[PDB]
């Protein structure tokens, strides 16, 4: 009831992940300004971020960004819908759709 | 009387051997297809230049391993042809076919 964890998987075609990070903000039920979250791990798809937020969230915004906004990978705001304080998504470079199962 | 399709294909495993394209005309005629091989490569992965000596507005495509050992996305998909040309980008396990480089 007081924490949300989102696992984000990210794949780039060149395999070069240095500096890329995730700008994530609470949308629902209570909106807040965002913060930056770093990748923590790796798997065969690319990098993995385990993002922990100290509230029970049903929706967050996300942008994939290079360092402190040097670039965005998909420039528009996107969102992740969350059930029971846990979600897991897969994001591909330059692909707008956020996937809820591994391609 | 010519259709040229450039197909770009990315696999996140980097293992492209044996993958090929089954492409068939769909409008204004439908015919049995043929296999087309990847001819080249770039930073996104493999490239196939597919030429069909017919005027077409639509073709079907399946990405397959060898002679139907597997399909990467196991439903028929289609490419729209514009003024006799198409260039698309296909990603492993992603249903949507893209008409600009991701
Ligand atoms: O007015 C105060 C306000 O505070 C919070 O809402 C702030 C803000 O939250 C949301 O903004 C998102 C943007 O939509 C999203 O693009 C991104 O902004 C990035 C840019 O994309 C970068 O280009 C660069 O400029 O940096 C910014 C981040 O600083 O992230 C923000 C959130 O951080 C929302 O969409 C906006 O409407 C909101 O103003 C409270 O939630 C809100 O209740 C309160 O009113
Ligand atoms: O006249 C032949 C046929 O053309 C069109 O069929 C296409 C299929 O829809 C399409 O799936 C693909 O079929 C292949 C299968 O997917 C594959 O598993 C395996 O069986 O090989 C098949 C190809 O030999 O391609 C064909 C075109 O070649 C059209 O949809 C049919 O209605 C039509 O009968």
- Which CATH number is associated with domain A1-103? 2.60.40.1110
Index of the ligand 1 atom closest to the CA of residue A35:
33
Give which of B63, B86, B85, B65 is closest to B74, Cα–Cα.
B63
Q: What is the resolution of this structure in A?
A: 1.4
Q: Residue B89 in contact with residue B102, Cβ under 8 Å?
A: yes
CA angle A28, A32, A36 (to 5 degrees): 110
Q: How many CB atoms lie within 10 A of CB B83?
A: 6
Q: Residue B38 in contact with residue B90, Cβ under 8 Å?
A: no
Determination technique used: X-ray
Contact A45 B93 (CB under 8 A): no
Find where tokens 């492209």 sit.
Answer: B16
Query: CA-CA distances (angstroms) from residue A53 to A5, A47, A57, A77, B23?
Result: 6, 19, 8, 19, 47
Strand pairing class (A41-43; A46-53):
antiparallel
Find where tokens 């330059």 sit.
Answer: A94
What torsion do the CA atoms of B5, B10, B15, B17 make, to the nearest 10 degrees?
0
Q: Residue A29 in contact with residue A46, Cβ under 8 Å?
A: no
User: Gaps after which residues in chain A, C–N over 2.5 Å?
Assistant: none
Helix, strand or coil, per DSSP, at residue B95: coil
Contact A95 B102 (CB under 8 A): yes
Beta bridge partner(s), residue B64:
B20, B71
CA separation for the pair B83, A55 (Å, rounded): 53
CATH topology for B1-102 is Immunoglobulin-like (2.60.40)
Strand pairing class (A59-66; B58-65):
unpaired
Give me A43's structure tokens.
């798997």
Give me B96's structure tokens.
């949507």
């Amino acid at each position: 009831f007081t924490e949300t964890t989102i696992v984000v998987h990210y794949h780039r075609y060149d395999g070069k992940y240095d500096g890329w990070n995730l700008w994530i903000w609470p949308v629902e039920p209570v909106s807040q300004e965002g913060k930056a979250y770093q990748f923590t791990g790796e798997d065969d798809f690319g990098k993995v971020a385990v993002v922990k937020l100290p509230m029970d969230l049903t929706k967050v915004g996300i942008i994939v960004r290079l360092n402190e906004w040097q670039a965005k990978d998909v420039a528009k705001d996107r969102f992740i819908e969350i059930k029971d304080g846990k979600a897991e998504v897969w994001i591909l470079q330059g692909v707008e759709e956020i996937f809820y199962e591994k391609p």
